[PDB]
Amino acid sequence: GSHMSFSGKYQLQSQENFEAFMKAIGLPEELIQKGKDIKGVSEIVQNGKHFKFTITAGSKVIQNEFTVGEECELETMTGEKVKTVVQLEGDNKLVTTFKNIKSVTELNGDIITNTMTLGDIVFKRISKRI
């Protein structure tokens, strides 16, 4: 419609630094190897400021819900729940932090770009609407 929305299902197209990032957060090496080639489908449901994300990151599916600007508890890729807040930087960019990770999710057309930074590791994902 006239007001942009993130809602959609999106399949991973390309990624960089998956292995590095997954090892940085401590995940099992066998799981990393199994997961690195998976082209995951993620789902976003937006209603106003409220979001539900169901994301496939390698062989893990993680579901999170939050309202922009409200304290949220996010499940991380380690399974840890962390209190934080998700912010908007313009209508098409969601930004958050948790445990020194900065996560940026941007919609441009049918492409969602996620950038997750931890130390000098920049974990980049590009997904396309299905």
User: Which domains are assigned to the chain?
Assistant: 8-129 (2.40.128.20)
Resolution (A): 1.3
Resolved by = X-ray
What gap in Å lies between CA 77 and CA 90, rounded to an integer?
26
Report the sign of the C-alpha dihedral through residues 100, 106, 52, 9, in that order.
negative
Strands (E), 1-130: 8-16, 41-47, 50-57, 60-67, 71-75, 81-88, 93-98, 101-108, 111-118, 121-129
CB 50, CB 43: distance < 8 Å: no
* Beta carbons within 8 Å of 15's beta carbon, 6+ residues apart: 123, 124, 125, 126
The residue type of 38 is I
